[PDB]
Amino acid sequence: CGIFAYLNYHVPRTRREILETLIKGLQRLEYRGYDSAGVGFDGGNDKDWEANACKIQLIKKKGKVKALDEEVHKQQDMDLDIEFDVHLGIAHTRWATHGEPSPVNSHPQRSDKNNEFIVIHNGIITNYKDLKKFLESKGYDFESETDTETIAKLVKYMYDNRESQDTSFTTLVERVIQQLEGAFALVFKSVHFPGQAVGTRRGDPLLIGVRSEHKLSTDHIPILYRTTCLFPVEEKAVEYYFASDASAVIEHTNRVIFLEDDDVAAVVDGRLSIHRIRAVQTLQMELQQIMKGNFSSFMQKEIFEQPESVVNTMRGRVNFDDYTVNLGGLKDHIKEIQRCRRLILIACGTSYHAGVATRQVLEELTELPVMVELASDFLDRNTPVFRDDVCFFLSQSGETADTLMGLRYCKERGALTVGITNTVGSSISRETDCGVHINAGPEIGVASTKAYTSQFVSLVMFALMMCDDRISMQERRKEIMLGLKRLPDLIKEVLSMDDEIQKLATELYHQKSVLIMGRGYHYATCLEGALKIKEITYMHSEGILAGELKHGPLALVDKLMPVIMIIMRDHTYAKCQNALQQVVARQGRPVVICDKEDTETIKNTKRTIKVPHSVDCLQGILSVIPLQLLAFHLAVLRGYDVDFPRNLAKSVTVE
Amino acid sequence: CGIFAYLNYHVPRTRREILETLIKGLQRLEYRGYDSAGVGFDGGNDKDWEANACKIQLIKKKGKVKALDEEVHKQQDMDLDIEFDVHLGIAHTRWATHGEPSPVNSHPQRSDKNNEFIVIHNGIITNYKDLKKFLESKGYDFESETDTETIAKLVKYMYDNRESQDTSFTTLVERVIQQLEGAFALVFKSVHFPGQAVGTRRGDPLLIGVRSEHKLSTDHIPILYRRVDSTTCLFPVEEKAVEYYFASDASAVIEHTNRVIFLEDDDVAAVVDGRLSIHRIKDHPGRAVQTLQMELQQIMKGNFSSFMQKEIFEQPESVVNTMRGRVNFDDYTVNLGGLKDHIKEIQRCRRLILIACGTSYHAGVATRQVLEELTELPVMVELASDFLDRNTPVFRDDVCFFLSQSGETADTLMGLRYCKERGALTVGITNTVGSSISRETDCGVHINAGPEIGVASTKAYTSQFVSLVMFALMMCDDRISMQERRKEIMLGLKRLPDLIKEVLSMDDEIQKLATELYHQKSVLIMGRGYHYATCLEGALKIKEITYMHSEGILAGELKHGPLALVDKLMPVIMIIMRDHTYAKCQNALQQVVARQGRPVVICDKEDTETIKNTKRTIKVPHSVDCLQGILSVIPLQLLAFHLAVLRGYDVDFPRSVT
Ligand SMILES: O=C[C@H](O)[C@@H](O)[C@H](O)[C@H](O)COP(=O)(O)O
Ligand SMILES: O=C[C@H](O)[C@@H](O)[C@H](O)[C@H](O)COP(=O)(O)O
Ligand SMILES: N[C@@H](CCC(=O)O)C(=O)O
């Protein structure tokens, strides 16, 4: 889900400029949830903007943001020409995991039929059922099936039983969160407090941007406990930007204030003050990073930019002149890591495949047991963990609920924890003892592509550090590092086969299933390839360990079943050729991803995808890219949007 | 593929009786699959059996053993009434590898047109190219494309170049195998050694059964290295009468006798003058005569129409057999006799590794959680093929379990030898007596589910499941804090046979589901926790038996991609049981329904909520959480069975040649 609000204080904006700002804000956050959207702004049609802050209009519609963009416009009651010197508007895009994505269930929610209080919410309230019964007895009627409504019906209950006639908006929100259980990120708006906003969080991101041509009173807001706020000095011109992510604010300003758990920010009279019952900083992001450029989709950009993102992952860490590796995030802990006795990798989805993809080389260069676990199952079994375990947590977002819960589980047992993330300041990067930022740049496509290859490389670099004191492994280290030096250019060679991959897609897009087979270093490749094809093309693709064919799954192969096989020139080549002969004996006609020089395979197979040869423990990077491209072209042929796959969104931060 | 030979020594048998014994033997070996079969025996219609020991007759044919039986009795120039006091007949079912199926490529292969030597062979001789060239240069002509023929020609080469006129049949075979490369099980017969047999193996099973109404000389045959006297071989003491049975599978011997000798690699067994001796080339090493508990009834369909149906519906009995003598339901204790001398060491180790293939691997996934809970040790579950590819680190304080119904699976066996070299304590969980994995592990447990004749693993899965739970119960038997948990689990084991019958009584409900999926090409099977393995195992069964694209999906992973497959057309089966993951499973159900999925749910009989909100539900009885996996997988076994029947497939049919 995504949160965005626009508060213009004494900055005259017309009602159109405001709505186009809310919509444009949801467009930046749409990849986090695109089942339904909605906005909340001040209604009425009075020239004097002051006589309009007593009427709250809500426009909510099912579908992507483009469905709300058109619902907002071409309306017969709203006059988009009213000038507002002061105004507050809130917006929200929802990932409807449960129930129907109906306008009633979308945000902002409301507290009554007159819209006295409206709130937008990211997260889950674990006790909303108790709150719902308590509020129903006091005379409040519920309309939607969402847990967010209990927050709106409750903030009004604290308002209908206050002690003084002028209790600050903060005091009301403070009493609410004390009754809420779970994780949440909230932004309130009310008619009683015109232009006032309140932002509190607890286990979910929520920052506050700010723009003003004038100077700010401070760059360090002092947190308070139940003059001294952030605001322009001489004049009042200020624009705030509440948001759950930075991509929605970077286009307007690069000055934000990342809140923390139970911090209740409040903008009053155009002054930001934090209450709790704190550091205006510059963002290191460029807008170009979250633009499609000349590509028609984000996913295509992020696939073709992998030559660059791989380089950025190694920048300032790998030195090819003297063959050294240094990960600054691990300098103070690498010594203690080497005294540990087991490595555990915990992650979800594609991030889990990155651990499968590097498990073998990690076992080789560290000589330690390496265990790779799906976060959800890791938690279900209450896996044993000990004080001399090193536990890695791979997460592009750094907020995945299952991976994050596994982190807190391993900390409670005294393990040394390491974070491999692509999001600075994320929960996983903050709560681990050390870690590495893969530095692949923002990923907007729902399906992770460059995050996978950058996680791959990051884990290889770690493996290189763990063995830099072994004489017997020096040549092996050099071999790997030379492969890393040549990897960006070999990726470019793979991308140049884009047209050849597209032609093969035209022969498969009509099929219902496809089996992808590989072993050894390329077990992860066929699992990741099968997940991508599932995710964006909706074909029933499955990854099958090649060594397991003879134990049952080979029965599913016939001349009609599509098959893709990975046969690279490493120590499993002969066994892979054996599996290929098994498939052919069952009349299968597979597409083979093989090496350019593999002349034997190229002659005896009609359809081959010839990738350049790299070091055996890096080849997985070059073998997965063809399957990234195949999934893209397959999705285009089937008429689906690669950036917005049905039934989900990016980053699973809730149950 | 299948070997069987019958040697009657001073037990008079007619030629008809001998041939009916060979045919009956091969009928016990058909379930392994084959394309051709043949037999070899003494021909000639001289009433004195002693004069016919120089004319070997062969009857080989492409097709099923039944057709071979017709060809036998369909011989005008053969008299079936001759009585042989001594005789050796051999028989073979072939699974073609080198040479296409045909009468010429069928076994027994011969050494020349006069049939001076014949041999039946299971396996492949790798260097059959080099050997064929050498024999062709010495003046030997081949008539088949089989690698086996080089064995028949080579033994004659050794005979034609023997230094002494009385070189033993054993010596000739020793020189043959010293020149062979690969895997083989062999039985030899020759006119120059009438009434004698020689069997040897390398990497392929070969056993010998014995029967006599007289006392035998010993139950432990000492090995002989390069004097054969009364004190070194097996024979009837006071009289000559005795019968020997060579076979590659005990299923072909058990109806005649239950006393068998399992040969080992490079053993050369020979019967000379009705006496059995075992030779090698290189405290007192020897081979034991042991008693199999196998019964002919265990390898017969009975009233069932298929072995798959039998083995699914007898799981109440096989589960009981797995627990017999091991779980005391009078004082609630567990004792696995196979681990008595090692349970002490095992409890001092620091990690458990389970290594297996296919369904046996799923049995490790199905018990990983309870093993972690009751042992408190790290438990790692590994597919044997990937375990080898990665050169997984293993240490001296690891306990490595090797799960294999057959006890012969190549990758699992190579995993075992890998772990032994690194000093790990090794444990075999097998269902085949005499198998390589049961012999080479430090200790082991025979799951005792009875022979598995069906093509897919059904009772072996649930019997492995139970065996590993029993081991987990042993490991925590000294912990006060776990007594209640152990009792809860053991009462679940006590009730499990009756709960399986209760699930089998819902067969009619499963048939209704099969008709719903009859026309479908894919189905997703979703679950988590204790039932992750149920999804993988059910998906494998439906793939293997029904040939449709079933896939197991970890429910906790849906929102990370796989949920995109859900719509109103994709069939889904979800497992929702009453354990600690119930709420999370309900969560996954709402995620599927919200996207137009209409899944079938396997749930508890008393889960009234899900039964009302879901159209079709398979309602199994509730058991202990770490045992529900057995009850929830059986509806998927039956589903695979019924779907295959509806589509006209032969569930007992397994489904290139150089
Ligand atoms: O293509 C699939 C997606 O990339 C998805 O499977 C992703 O890998 C998980 O959602 C993990 O999320 P994070 O690694 O970002 O926490
Ligand atoms: O239905 C599955 C089959 O039974 C097959 O997958 C089998 O489980 C493996 O070939 C392992 O065989 P073993 O149990 O003999 O090791
Ligand atoms: N390799 C031999 C025997 C194969 C077998 O029956 O296992 C052949 O093809 O004739």
Residue numbers in the entry:
A (entry chain B): 2 to 227, 244 to 294, 304 to 681
B (entry chain A): 2 to 227, 240 to 295, 300 to 672, 677 to 679
Sentences copied from the publication:
HP activity is regulated by its first and rate-limiting enzyme glutamine fructose-6-phosphate amidotransferase (GFAT, EC 2.6.1.16). GFAT is a modular enzyme composed of a glutaminase domain responsible for hydrolysis of l-Gln into l-glutamate (l-Glu) and an isomerase/transferase domain that catalyzes the isomerization of Frc6P to glucose-6-phosphate (Glc6P) as well as the transfer of ammonia to Glc6P to build glucosamine-6-phosphate (GlcN6P). The relative orientation of the two domains with their respective active sites is relevant for catalysis and affected by substrate binding. GFAT-1 activity is modulated by UDP-GlcNAc feedback inhibition and via phosphorylation by protein kinase A (PKA).
We aimed to mechanistically understand the effect of Ser205 phosphorylation and generated a GFAT-1 S205D mutant to mimic the phosphorylation. To analyze the molecular consequence of the S205D substitution in human GFAT-1, we solved the crystal structure at 2.22 Å resolution. In the S205D crystal structure, we did not observe major structural differences compared to wild type GFAT-1. Notably, the PKA target residue Ser205 is located in a loop of the glutaminase domain pointing towards the glutaminase active site and the interdomain cleft between the glutaminase and isomerase domains. Ser205 is thus optimally positioned to influence domain interactions upon phosphorylation. Overall GlcN6P synthesis was decreased ~5-fold in the phospho-mimic mutant (kcat/Km: 4.4 mM−1 sec−1) compared to wild type GFAT-1 (kcat/Km: 21.3 mM−1 sec−1). Strikingly, the dose-dependent inhibition by UDP-GlcNAc was completely abolished in the S205D variant. Compared to wild type GFAT-1, the S205D mutant showed strongly reduced thermal stability of the glutaminase domain, as indicated by the specific reduction of the lower melting point. Instead, its reduced thermal stability is likely caused by altered interactions between the glutaminase and isomerase domains. We propose that Ser205 phosphorylation suppresses UDP-GlcNAc inhibition by stabilizing the glutaminase and isomerase domains in a catalytically productive orientation.
